RNA sequence: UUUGGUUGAUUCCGUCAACGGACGAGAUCCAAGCUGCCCAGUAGGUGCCGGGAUUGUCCACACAGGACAGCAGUCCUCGUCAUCCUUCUUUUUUCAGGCCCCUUCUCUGCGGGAUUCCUUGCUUUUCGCGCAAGGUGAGAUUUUGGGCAACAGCAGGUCUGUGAUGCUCCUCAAUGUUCUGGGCGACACGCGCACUACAAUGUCAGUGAGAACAAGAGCGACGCUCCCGCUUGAUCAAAAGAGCGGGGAAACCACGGAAUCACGUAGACCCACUUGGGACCGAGUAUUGCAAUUAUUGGUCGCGCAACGAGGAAUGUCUCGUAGGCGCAGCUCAUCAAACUGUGCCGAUUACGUCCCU
């Protein structure tokens, strides 16, 4: 019930995307690749932001807190069981990608079952679904 | 001592009239606590007009598919309702809600027999004025930031005046033209 | 002193409403334990409270009701609540009163709701097998 | 009395949306439960029974009856 | 306007579909007409006649 | 509760000849009985496709079978009990003696 | 519709030349003395033969009747 | 029909204009506060519990979804 | 065995070159709704005694806090004897229960109950057979739903049910039989039937009360093998794993906490392909199985920028606890239900007609 101030931004940009301001916080960073819903509460929490407040009226302050958070989850007592890429199959590693790395590692995955020739990089090429479905009716562009 | 039903414990049945004669013989005034009976109405032809007149304007907004079967949320919508009218015209809601039946359905209809005009009967007449203010303000408060009961509470009011922002008023005028210009 | 008690039950779907009546110090309505004014539906409060208004508070002055409901949903246990008080004021002023106020009060519950006193028959109907329902037939193609 | 946490995770069920398929009930997670009792046990008002499940102790039901009263006196402020 | 008359008598189904009834109905100066009602009726019930220069065939 | 007799059939007057008779035999000697208790019947169903081969209307058959159970309790001596049972069964009524 | 089938008919009518006498014109007494007399297993069928031979006792009391012949 | 275009955070204009012009209304709801000040619905939600702590309005109807305020007079 | 009235009815009355008979319809059978005997240590109840908890001269009354029973302190002196709630497992004189009595509610094998029975009005001149509205009633018209169902047929389907079967084909590198591996599903497209949606009469997150039908264990690995509950795992996710027990099923699961539903929750969102919708796809895990790749299944985090904003011509089903909506069990089943067979929950609008289309 604050009156509204003249540093509200309508366009917050943050890991490279355009923010909303009229969204409310969790809801505003969802709109960023590699968080979702669940992801987004919990680096709320861990950032000491209120989830009641709008995506604009977020002082620089808070959003290289925010940025601290995504970048190393693992320091912030996140679970390895809640983060995408848990086992990378080349390096190893726990990590959780955002912000067109998930685009760039997609793509890198699709590569390498190509080159050794696995069914499911065949299917990719071909352009056909992966999980077992039935295509007689399905897809049908 | 028992005394007389109030509707939502709050409007009297006390002094409430039909000025139309034609249907004073099916709309039923007689006093209820809850618009909720349970009974069996549809046993015989005639038997539904004796349905207290704020029960069935309650049955008629539960429609759709996702809406089919829910009469506890009907009577919460109405109960709302109510409220509103009362705010906006400074009399009985009830009262209200009888003036609208009474004048929201045509009284001359065409029907294929070319077309022919013919009369209407006096059950048909309340049925129908039912029918018409609850589509009206169904389709007026889809995809709306308006909500249900403010909705229903403007049809109803302005049915009730006669003006011709109501959907049955609208609809009416246009099928007695029709059967007017017809024969 | 010699105890003052009666039983009655009132029926709805599968639903079976047992009311005990008691003459106690002071009248008390409950409901599976929990106190009438308590009951969390209004539109469901005022239906079982029709059993008390239509004849008048002045009756139930120093009589407990104890009712317990097993069977159906929450609707449906409420018009077998509604019976069973109705039937246990009747059955309690039978014995120890006189025909003359009992014959009072019973017109005045048959005059009002008939379904107060006298059970509704109408139950569930069966499925068939090629209807996906009672009546619902399947669909044909051509 | 006696109930336990298979039991109590009946109490708390819900329904789960499935996607393009029909929905399911689904009961609470008993895991939480235990940890709740386990909660309640360390405050000593929860005990358990000597043949199966959980009851609340003479403190318990005075903690929960004396709520009661506060509600009842308005109280609430 | 419109004039409100009383059905005395039914006089039976009218049209191919049989959902038009045909009345005997008195005005409100000891005038009788025969008219074609639409939806369901019985004696003793209530009409708001727009005209009354007219009548239905039989 | 010292002996608990119980009888189970398919047929409903089977069951009631032989209930009746045993009581009968105890009446006759004067050993005390909890009369007879009906337990719920129980009813097996079966649905099956008409056909053979699958094709017409779809139509199903329906098939039922209803299990009739009584209980007696007795209290009497041990070898009194043996002498009260004796007696020959009907075909078809299972008859089983129980000691809680 | 609520016709009587000629089965009933016909007991009806052998009921009321042979029991003439002891029957009068109320349901619930005919009944009694219908299931005295009938050999006959429907319940449904005897109420039936007994509705239909009080008619008849109503039909004899104002007027001979076609097929009686007491 | 183009959009509704609704604030979401009060402001100094439509303040005051909450405070002034709309306790004079006869029938009052966050629907009909939201279109005659473009803000939404939840902001006026907000601004209406506000004015009835005040006491400059008063509750008619209350429910878990549903509120119709009025004014105090 | 026609015609005239009547009936869902070749159902009845009357007439009659026909008279006597058989089937089918009706009756019989199963289930539901109201009731009589019988009945319980597997169904339930009052009454005392014991144990446990709250307990108020007045005032105080949620932060913004209302409407709706009881009242010996009111009313115009009469009327009150006594404040409420729980006692599951368990078996013990306390590890909290013990006793004496009843059959309203539950269980069910034979029975009762309904008949156009009563009234009024219609009904081929009368009559007769009947009809409509009301009454009595738990129920008022085939009581409501099923099951059964004649005589004539169809080149309808099945030789993929059988140790049902005629001719005919193969028959030791076999069209017999078994084992290993594939396929039955493969995808530029056309069609039938379902499931999920296009949002505010909503989505998400909490709190409250609350159903019926049912099911369950002896080859290959010393009993076991099926279905469940309580603990523990737990000084830290789900999904697991492990101890201790119960049930042959009115004795366990279980006081069977289903989902629509409700909430004055002073909850979040506000008309946008948006917290609508969840297709498609990536990465980690546990379980079933001798074997999971062409993802068996469950669970977790990402993707949501995939259509879709109510659907042209055409078209399906349906008249009362029904339509529609909401879940649950059985079945198939080592593991899988967007299917079918049943069951309950919430619960309407319209008609009580006609021969216009078929
Ligand atoms: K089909
Ligand atoms: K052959
Ligand atoms: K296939
Ligand atoms: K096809
Ligand atoms: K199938
Ligand atoms: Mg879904
Ligand atoms: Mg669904
Ligand atoms: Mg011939
Ligand atoms: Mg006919
Ligand atoms: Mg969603
Ligand atoms: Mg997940
Ligand atoms: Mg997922
Ligand atoms: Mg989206
Ligand atoms: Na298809
Ligand atoms: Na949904």
Redesign the interface.
């Known amino acids: 019930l604050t009156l509204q101030s003249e540093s509200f931004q309508h366009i917050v940009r943050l890991l490279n995307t355009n923010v909303e301001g009229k969204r409310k916080v969790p809801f505003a960073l969802r709109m960023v690749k590699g968080i979702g819903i669940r992801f987004a509460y919990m680096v709320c929490k861990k950032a000491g932001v209120d989830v009641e407040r709008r995506a604009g009226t977020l002082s620089p302050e808070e959003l290289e807190k925010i940025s601290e958070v995504i970048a190393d989850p693992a320091k912030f007592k996140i679970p390895e069981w809640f983060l995408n890429r848990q086992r990378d199959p080349k390096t190893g590693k726990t990590e959780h990608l955002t912000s067109s790395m998930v685009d760039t590692r997609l793509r890198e995955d699709l590569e390498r079952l190509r080159k050794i020739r696995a069914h499911r990089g065949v299917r990719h090429a071909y352009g056909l679904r992966v999980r077992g479905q039935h295509t007689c009716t399905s897809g049908r562009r | 001592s028992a005394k007389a039903p109030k509707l939502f414990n709050k409007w009297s049945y006390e002094n409430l009239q039909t000025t139309e004669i034609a249907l004073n013989d099916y709309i039923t005034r007689t006093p209820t606590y809850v618009p909720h009976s349970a009974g069996r109405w549809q046993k015989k032809r005639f038997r539904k007009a004796r349905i207290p007149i704020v029960e069935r304007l309650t049955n008629g907004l539960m429609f759709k598919g996702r809406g089919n079967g829910k009469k506890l949320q009907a009577v919460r919508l109405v109960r709302h309702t109510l409220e509103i009218i009362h705010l906006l015209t400074d009399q009985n809601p009830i009262q209200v809600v009888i003036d609208a039946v009474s004048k929201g359905a045509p009284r001359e209809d065409s029907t294929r027999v070319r077309r022919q005009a013919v009369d209407v009967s006096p059950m048909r007449r309340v049925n129908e004025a039912i029918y018409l203010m609850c589509k009206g303000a169904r389709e007026a408060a889809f995809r709306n930031l308006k909500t249900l009961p403010e909705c229903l509470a403007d049809e109803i009011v302005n049915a009730s005046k006669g003006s011709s922002n109501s959907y049955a008023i609208k609809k009416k005028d246009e099928v007695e033209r029709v059967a007017k210009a017809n024969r | 002193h010699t105890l003052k008690q009666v039983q009655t039950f009132g029926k709805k779907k599968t639903a079976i409403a047992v009311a005990t009546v008691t003459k106690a110090p002071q009248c008390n309505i409950r409901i599976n334990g929990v106190p009438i004014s308590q009951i969390l539906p209004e539109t469901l409060r005022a239906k079982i409270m029709e059993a008390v208004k239509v004849v008048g508070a002045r009756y139930f002055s120093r009589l407990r009701v104890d009712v317990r409901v097993r069977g159906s949903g929450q609707v449906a246990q409420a018009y077998a609540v509604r019976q069973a008080i109705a039937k246990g004021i009747i059955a309690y002023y039978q014995k120890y009163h006189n025909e003359i106020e009992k014959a009072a009060l019973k017109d005045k519950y048959l005059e009002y709701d008939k379904f107060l006193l006298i059970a509704d028959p109408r139950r569930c109907e069966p499925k068939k097998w090629g209807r996906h329902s009672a009546r619902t037939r399947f669909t044909k193609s051509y | 009395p006696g109930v336990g946490y298979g039991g109590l995770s009946k109490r708390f069920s819900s329904k789960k949306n499935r996607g393009s398929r029909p929905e399911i009930t689904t009961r609470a997670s008993k895991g939480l439960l235990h940890w709740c009792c386990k909660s309640l046990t360390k405050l000593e008002l929860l005990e358990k029974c000597k043949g199966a499940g959980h009851r609340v102790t003479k403190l318990g039901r005075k903690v929960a009856d004396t709520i009661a009263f506060k509600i009842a006196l308005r109280k609430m402020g | 306007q419109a004039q409100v008359g009383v059905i005395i008598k039914v006089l039976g189904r009218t049209g191919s579909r049989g959902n038009v009834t045909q009345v005997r109905v008195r005005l409100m100066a000891n005038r009788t007409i025969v008219r074609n009602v639409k939806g369901p009726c019985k004696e003793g019930d209530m009409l708001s006649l727009m005209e009354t220069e007219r009548e239905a065939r039989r | 509760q010292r002996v608990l007799v119980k009888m189970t059939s398919r047929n409903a007057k089977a069951v009631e000849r032989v209930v009746a008779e045993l009581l009968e035999h105890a009446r006759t000697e004067k050993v005390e009985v909890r009369g007879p208790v009906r337990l719920p019947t129980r009813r097996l169903r079966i649905?099956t496709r008409k056909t053979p081969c699958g094709n017409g209307?779809?139509?199903?058959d329906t098939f039922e079978m209803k299990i009739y159970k009584r209980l007696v309790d007795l209290r009497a001596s041990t070898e009194l009990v043996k002498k009260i049972t004796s007696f020959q069964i009907e075909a078809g009524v299972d008859v089983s003696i129980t000691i809680p | 519709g609520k016709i009587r089938t000629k089965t009933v008919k016909r007991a009806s009518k052998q009921i009321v030349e042979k029991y003439f006498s002891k029957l009068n014109k109320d349901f619930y007494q005919n009944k009694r003395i219908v299931m005295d007399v009938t050999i006959a297993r429907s319940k449904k069928l005897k109420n039936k033969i007994a509705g239909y031979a009080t008619h008849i006792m109503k039909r004899l009391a104002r007027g001979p009747v076609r097929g009686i012949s007491l | 029909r183009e959009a509704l275009q609704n604030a979401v955070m009060f402001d100094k204009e439509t303040m005051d204009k909450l405070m002034k012009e709309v306790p004079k209304y006869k029938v009052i709801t966050p629907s009909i506060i939201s279109d005659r000040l473009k803000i939404s619905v939840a902001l006026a939600g907000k601004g209406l519990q506000h004015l009835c702590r005040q006491g400059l309005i008063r509750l008619v109807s209350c429910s878990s979804k549903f509120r119709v305020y009025t004014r105090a007079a």
Do not use: I
């Open positions: 649905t209307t779809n139509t199903w």
